[PDB]
Design an enzyme around this catalytic site. Structure first.
Site, PDB file in Angstrom:
ATOM      1  N   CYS A   1       0.411  -0.958  -0.533  1.00 27.44           N
ATOM      2  CA  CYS A   1      -0.037  -0.233  -0.148  1.00 27.44           C
ATOM      3  C   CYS A   1       0.969   1.034  -0.039  1.00 27.44           C
ATOM      4  O   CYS A   1       1.749   1.413   1.198  1.00 27.44           O
ATOM      5  CB  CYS A   1      -1.010   0.294   0.937  1.00 27.44           C
ATOM      6  SG  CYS A   1      -2.258  -0.990   0.937  1.00 27.44           S
ATOM      7  N   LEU A   2       0.909   1.795  -0.871  1.00 30.29           N
ATOM      8  CA  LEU A   2       1.614   2.921  -1.159  1.00 30.29           C
ATOM      9  C   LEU A   2       0.507   4.141  -1.383  1.00 30.29           C
ATOM     10  O   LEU A   2       0.080   4.138  -2.682  1.00 30.29           O
ATOM     11  CB  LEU A   2       3.322   2.897  -2.235  1.00 30.29           C
ATOM     12  CG  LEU A   2       3.913   4.382  -2.747  1.00 30.29           C
ATOM     13  CD1 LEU A   2       4.293   4.474  -1.056  1.00 30.29           C
ATOM     14  CD2 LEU A   2       4.511   3.292  -4.036  1.00 30.29           C
TER      15      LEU A   2
END
Length: 150
Positions: free
Chosen positions: A84-85
């Site tokens: 998750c960026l």
């Protein structure tokens, strides 16, 4: 799209950040890149980690997608290289975001784990509760699966 991606590619290969190596686009596809990430944070600094950056046909309206191909033991990456960026989430993605900024933020994430909102919680807990034990865990895993460090 390929037009935007190629020039981004050229600019990064020419002037790479120190933590990014072997930046090149797939033999076939110009909208897939591969690169080695070189984390500084122990024990990941012993190895280098290959990643697949995919640009969708819609890019830059749509965000690119990064995954680790090399296995890494990390609070913020899963066993399948997923992350998750925020910078490239749909909520946050802005067409005027460049790939170098994406890569910068990923380098940051890898170096400084997000324990508040992790992918692997047990790992986040371990890292807070027994840093030395985490370090042993990550090390064996790094040595075992990591690409050699340039």
């Amino acid at each position: 799209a390929s037009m935007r991606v190629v020039k981004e590619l050229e600019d990064l290969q020419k002037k790479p950040p120190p933590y990014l190596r072997n930046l090149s686009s797939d033999d076939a596809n110009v909208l897939v890149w591969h690169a080695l990430l070189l984390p500084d944070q122990p024990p990941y600094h012993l190895k280098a980690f290959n990643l697949r950056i995919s640009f969708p046909p819609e890019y830059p309206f749509k965000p690119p997608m990064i995954k680790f191909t090399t296995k890494i033991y990390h609070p913020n990456v899963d066993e399948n290289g997923q992350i998750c960026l925020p910078i490239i989430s749909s909520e946050n993605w802005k067409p005027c975001t460049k790939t170098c900024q994406v890569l910068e933020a990923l380098n940051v994430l890898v170096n400084r784990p997000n324990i508040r909102e992790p992918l692997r919680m047990d790992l986040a807990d371990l890292l807070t509760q027994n840093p030395e034990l985490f370090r042993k865990n990550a090390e064996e895993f790094t040595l075992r699966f990591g690409v050699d460090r340039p």
